[PDB]
Amino acid sequence: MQLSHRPAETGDLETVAGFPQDRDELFYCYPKAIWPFSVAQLAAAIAERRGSTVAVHDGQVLGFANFYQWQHGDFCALGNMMVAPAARGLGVARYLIGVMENLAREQYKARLMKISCFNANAAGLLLYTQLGYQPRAIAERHDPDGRRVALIQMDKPLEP
Ligand SMILES: CC(C)(COP(=O)(O)OP(=O)(O)OC[C@H]1O[C@@H](n2cnc3c(N)ncnc32)[C@H](O)[C@@H]1OP(=O)(O)O)[C@@H](O)C(=O)NCCC(=O)NCCSCCCC[C@H](NC(=O)CNC(=O)Cc1ccccc1)C(=O)O
């Protein structure tokens, strides 16, 4: 469907902060955040990151992403990837990741995009696989209940 993108704005914060539907979803897209998510937590992430971007369809903000890490000439890492629940499965994240890949290439001369995905997040793992990301390593992490989870580190070459 028809999608556009632009930098995130203050008026987008309340909608975007509403995207994660439970503690698990919040952990998957922003593991340092604390449930419940809030506009203050989102604004703080935006201020300390780069490239915060929204995807819009039919006047609705449906998706958000930024760079978790950025290293000129080297790589960027995708951060805070989240989509409105009613709009999932429709290509919003696919679209926005394409946008972020282009931004990494153009703004950071990145050769590689990194994406890390928690093991329980099948939807994420499958999407990133469809976009050409390959798994490289697995790291142990802990969820908010102190349970041990596996963070799967994936990457993809970008090219000029
Ligand atoms: C986005 C979403 C997954 C997808 O958005 P879509 O808009 O919905 O995606 P389409 O573009 O439509 O494409 C979807 C594709 O997948 C196929 N599909 C399969 N199953 C499906 C299903 N059930 N449903 C739908 N689709 C399913 C489907 O067929 C299609 O493939 P084809 O049909 O096209 O082939 C959507 O469902 C979402 O928002 N989920 C909730 C949030 C979320 O999980 N976000 C991803 C985060 S991974 C990124 C995490 C970045 C994390 C980062 N930190 C790090 O990296 C590392 N720091 C740390 O660890 C620090 C730390 C601190 C404390 C303690 C431990 C550690 C950061 O802090 O920011």
CSV table of C-alpha atoms and ligand atoms in Angstrom, one decimal:
chain,number,residue,atom,x,y,z
A,1,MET,CA,0.0,0.0,0.0
A,2,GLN,CA,0.9,3.7,-0.4
A,3,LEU,CA,3.7,4.7,2.1
A,4,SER,CA,5.7,7.9,2.7
A,5,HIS,CA,8.4,8.7,5.2
A,6,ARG,CA,9.7,11.7,7.1
A,7,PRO,CA,11.7,12.5,10.3
A,8,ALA,CA,9.8,11.9,13.5
A,9,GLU,CA,8.2,15.0,15.0
A,10,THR,CA,7.0,15.8,18.5
A,11,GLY,CA,3.3,15.3,17.5
A,12,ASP,CA,4.1,11.7,16.5
A,13,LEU,CA,5.4,10.7,20.0
A,14,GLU,CA,2.0,9.8,21.6
A,15,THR,CA,1.0,7.5,18.7
A,16,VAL,CA,4.4,5.8,18.4
A,17,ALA,CA,4.7,5.3,22.2
A,18,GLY,CA,1.4,3.5,21.9
A,19,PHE,CA,2.8,0.9,19.4
A,20,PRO,CA,4.3,-1.7,21.8
A,21,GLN,CA,1.3,-3.8,23.2
A,22,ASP,CA,2.8,-5.5,26.2
A,23,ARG,CA,6.0,-5.8,28.2
A,24,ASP,CA,7.4,-8.4,25.8
A,25,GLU,CA,6.9,-6.2,22.7
A,26,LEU,CA,8.5,-3.3,24.4
A,27,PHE,CA,11.5,-5.5,25.4
A,28,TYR,CA,11.8,-6.7,21.8
A,29,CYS,CA,12.1,-3.2,20.3
A,30,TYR,CA,13.7,-1.3,23.2
A,31,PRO,CA,15.2,-3.7,25.8
A,32,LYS,CA,16.6,-0.8,28.0
A,33,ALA,CA,13.1,0.8,28.3
A,34,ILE,CA,10.8,0.1,31.3
A,35,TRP,CA,7.1,-0.8,30.9
A,36,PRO,CA,4.9,1.1,30.6
A,37,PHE,CA,6.4,2.9,27.6
A,38,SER,CA,5.9,6.7,27.6
A,39,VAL,CA,6.5,9.7,25.5
A,40,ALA,CA,9.4,10.8,27.8
A,41,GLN,CA,11.2,7.5,27.2
A,42,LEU,CA,10.6,7.7,23.5
A,43,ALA,CA,11.8,11.3,23.3
A,44,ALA,CA,14.9,10.4,25.3
A,45,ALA,CA,15.7,7.6,22.8
A,46,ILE,CA,15.3,9.9,19.9
A,47,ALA,CA,17.5,12.6,21.4
A,48,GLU,CA,20.4,10.1,22.0
A,49,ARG,CA,20.0,8.2,18.7
A,50,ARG,CA,20.1,9.2,15.0
A,51,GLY,CA,17.8,8.9,12.1
A,52,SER,CA,14.4,8.7,13.8
A,53,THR,CA,11.9,8.2,11.0
A,54,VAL,CA,8.2,7.6,10.7
A,55,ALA,CA,6.2,5.7,7.9
A,56,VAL,CA,2.9,7.2,7.0
A,57,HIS,CA,-0.1,5.8,5.1
A,58,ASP,CA,-3.4,7.5,4.5
A,59,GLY,CA,-2.5,10.2,7.0
A,60,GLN,CA,-1.6,7.8,9.8
A,61,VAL,CA,1.7,7.2,11.4
A,62,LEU,CA,2.1,3.4,11.2
A,63,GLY,CA,5.8,2.8,11.7
A,64,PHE,CA,8.9,4.1,13.5
A,65,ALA,CA,12.6,3.3,13.4
A,66,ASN,CA,16.0,4.8,14.2
A,67,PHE,CA,19.7,3.9,14.4
A,68,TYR,CA,20.7,2.2,17.6
A,69,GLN,CA,24.4,2.6,16.5
A,70,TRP,CA,26.1,4.4,13.7
A,71,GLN,CA,29.7,4.3,12.6
A,72,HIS,CA,30.7,6.3,9.5
A,73,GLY,CA,32.2,4.3,6.7
A,74,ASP,CA,31.4,1.1,8.6
A,75,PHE,CA,27.9,0.1,9.7
A,76,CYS,CA,24.7,1.2,11.3
A,77,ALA,CA,22.5,-0.9,13.6
A,78,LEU,CA,18.7,-0.7,13.4
A,79,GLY,CA,16.9,0.5,16.5
A,80,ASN,CA,13.4,0.8,18.0
A,81,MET,CA,11.6,-0.8,15.0
A,82,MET,CA,7.9,-0.6,15.8
A,83,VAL,CA,4.6,-0.8,13.9
A,84,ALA,CA,1.0,0.0,14.8
A,85,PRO,CA,-0.6,-3.4,15.7
A,86,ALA,CA,-3.5,-3.0,13.2
A,87,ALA,CA,-1.0,-2.3,10.4
A,88,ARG,CA,1.3,-5.3,10.9
A,89,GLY,CA,1.9,-7.8,8.1
A,90,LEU,CA,1.3,-5.1,5.5
A,91,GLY,CA,4.9,-4.1,4.5
A,92,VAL,CA,5.4,-1.2,6.9
A,93,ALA,CA,8.5,-2.5,8.5
A,94,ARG,CA,9.8,-3.8,5.1
A,95,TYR,CA,9.3,-0.3,3.7
A,96,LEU,CA,10.9,1.5,6.7
A,97,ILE,CA,13.9,-0.9,6.8
A,98,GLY,CA,14.5,-0.1,3.1
A,99,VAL,CA,14.4,3.6,4.0
A,100,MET,CA,16.9,3.1,6.9
A,101,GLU,CA,19.2,1.0,4.7
A,102,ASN,CA,19.3,3.9,2.2
A,103,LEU,CA,19.9,6.4,5.0
A,104,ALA,CA,22.8,4.3,6.4
A,105,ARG,CA,24.4,4.2,2.9
A,106,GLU,CA,23.9,7.9,2.2
A,107,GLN,CA,24.4,9.6,5.6
A,108,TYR,CA,27.0,7.2,7.1
A,109,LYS,CA,28.6,5.5,4.1
A,110,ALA,CA,27.7,2.3,5.8
A,111,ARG,CA,28.8,-1.0,4.2
A,112,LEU,CA,26.8,-3.2,6.6
A,113,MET,CA,23.5,-3.0,8.5
A,114,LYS,CA,23.3,-4.8,11.8
A,115,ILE,CA,19.9,-5.9,13.3
A,116,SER,CA,19.7,-7.8,16.6
A,117,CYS,CA,16.5,-9.7,17.4
A,118,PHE,CA,15.3,-11.5,20.5
A,119,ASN,CA,14.7,-15.2,20.0
A,120,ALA,CA,11.0,-15.1,21.0
A,121,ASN,CA,10.3,-12.6,18.2
A,122,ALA,CA,9.6,-14.9,15.3
A,123,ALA,CA,7.9,-12.2,13.3
A,124,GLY,CA,11.1,-10.1,13.4
A,125,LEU,CA,13.4,-13.0,12.6
A,126,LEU,CA,11.3,-14.0,9.6
A,127,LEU,CA,11.1,-10.5,8.3
A,128,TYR,CA,14.8,-9.9,8.6
A,129,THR,CA,15.5,-13.2,6.9
A,130,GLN,CA,13.2,-12.1,4.0
A,131,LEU,CA,15.1,-8.9,3.7
A,132,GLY,CA,18.4,-10.7,3.3
A,133,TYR,CA,19.8,-10.5,6.8
A,134,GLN,CA,21.9,-13.5,8.0
A,135,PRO,CA,22.5,-14.6,11.5
A,136,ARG,CA,26.0,-14.2,12.8
A,137,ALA,CA,26.0,-14.7,16.6
A,138,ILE,CA,23.9,-15.3,19.6
A,139,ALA,CA,24.3,-13.5,23.0
A,140,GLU,CA,22.6,-14.2,26.3
A,141,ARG,CA,20.5,-11.5,27.7
A,142,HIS,CA,17.9,-11.3,30.5
A,143,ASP,CA,14.3,-10.3,30.2
A,144,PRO,CA,12.3,-8.1,32.7
A,145,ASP,CA,11.5,-11.2,34.7
A,146,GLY,CA,15.2,-12.2,34.9
A,147,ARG,CA,14.7,-15.1,32.5
A,148,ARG,CA,17.5,-15.9,30.1
A,149,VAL,CA,16.9,-15.1,26.4
A,150,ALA,CA,18.9,-15.3,23.3
A,151,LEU,CA,19.7,-12.2,21.3
A,152,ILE,CA,20.4,-13.1,17.7
A,153,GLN,CA,22.8,-10.7,15.9
A,154,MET,CA,22.1,-10.5,12.2
A,155,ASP,CA,23.6,-8.4,9.4
A,156,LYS,CA,23.4,-7.6,5.7
A,157,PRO,CA,25.9,-5.9,3.2
A,158,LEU,CA,24.6,-2.6,1.9
A,159,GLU,CA,26.8,-1.4,-1.1
A,160,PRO,CA,27.1,2.1,-2.6
B,1,LIG,C1,8.3,-4.6,13.4
B,1,LIG,C2,7.5,-5.9,13.3
B,1,LIG,C3,8.3,-7.1,14.0
B,1,LIG,C4,7.3,-6.3,11.9
B,1,LIG,O1,6.6,-5.2,11.2
B,1,LIG,P1,5.6,-5.4,10.0
B,1,LIG,O2,5.2,-4.1,9.5
B,1,LIG,O3,4.4,-6.2,10.5
B,1,LIG,O4,6.4,-6.2,8.9
B,1,LIG,P2,6.1,-6.3,7.4
B,1,LIG,O5,6.9,-5.3,6.6
B,1,LIG,O6,4.6,-6.4,7.2
B,1,LIG,O7,6.8,-7.7,7.0
B,1,LIG,C5,6.5,-8.9,7.9
B,1,LIG,C6,7.1,-10.1,7.2
B,1,LIG,O8,7.2,-11.2,8.2
B,1,LIG,C7,6.3,-12.2,7.8
B,1,LIG,N1,5.6,-12.7,9.0
B,1,LIG,C8,5.9,-13.9,9.6
B,1,LIG,N2,5.2,-14.1,10.7
B,1,LIG,C9,4.5,-12.9,10.8
B,1,LIG,C10,3.5,-12.5,11.8
B,1,LIG,N3,3.1,-13.2,12.8
B,1,LIG,N4,2.9,-11.3,11.6
B,1,LIG,C11,3.2,-10.6,10.5
B,1,LIG,N5,4.1,-10.9,9.5
B,1,LIG,C12,4.7,-12.1,9.8
B,1,LIG,C13,5.3,-11.7,6.7
B,1,LIG,O9,4.8,-12.7,5.9
B,1,LIG,C14,6.3,-10.7,6.0
B,1,LIG,O10,7.1,-11.3,5.1
B,1,LIG,P3,6.8,-11.5,3.5
B,1,LIG,O11,5.4,-12.0,3.4
B,1,LIG,O12,7.0,-10.0,3.0
B,1,LIG,O13,7.8,-12.4,3.0
B,1,LIG,C15,6.1,-5.7,14.0
B,1,LIG,O14,5.5,-7.0,14.2
B,1,LIG,C16,6.2,-5.1,15.4
B,1,LIG,O15,6.2,-3.8,15.5
B,1,LIG,N6,6.4,-5.9,16.4
B,1,LIG,C17,6.5,-5.3,17.8
B,1,LIG,C18,7.8,-4.6,18.0
B,1,LIG,C19,9.0,-5.5,17.5
B,1,LIG,O16,9.1,-6.7,17.8
B,1,LIG,N7,9.9,-4.9,16.8
B,1,LIG,C20,11.1,-5.5,16.2
B,1,LIG,C21,12.3,-5.3,17.1
B,1,LIG,S1,13.7,-6.1,16.4
B,1,LIG,C22,15.0,-4.9,16.5
B,1,LIG,C23,15.4,-4.6,18.0
B,1,LIG,C24,16.3,-3.4,18.2
B,1,LIG,C25,16.9,-3.4,19.6
B,1,LIG,C26,18.0,-2.4,19.8
B,1,LIG,N8,19.0,-2.9,20.7
B,1,LIG,C27,19.9,-3.8,20.3
B,1,LIG,O17,19.9,-4.2,19.1
B,1,LIG,C28,20.8,-4.4,21.3
B,1,LIG,N9,20.7,-3.9,22.7
B,1,LIG,C29,20.4,-4.6,23.8
B,1,LIG,O18,20.2,-5.8,23.7
B,1,LIG,C30,20.5,-3.9,25.1
B,1,LIG,C31,19.8,-4.6,26.2
B,1,LIG,C32,19.2,-3.9,27.2
B,1,LIG,C33,18.6,-4.5,28.3
B,1,LIG,C34,18.5,-5.9,28.4
B,1,LIG,C35,19.2,-6.7,27.4
B,1,LIG,C36,19.8,-6.0,26.3
B,1,LIG,C37,17.4,-1.1,20.3
B,1,LIG,O19,17.5,-0.9,21.5
B,1,LIG,O20,16.8,-0.3,19.5
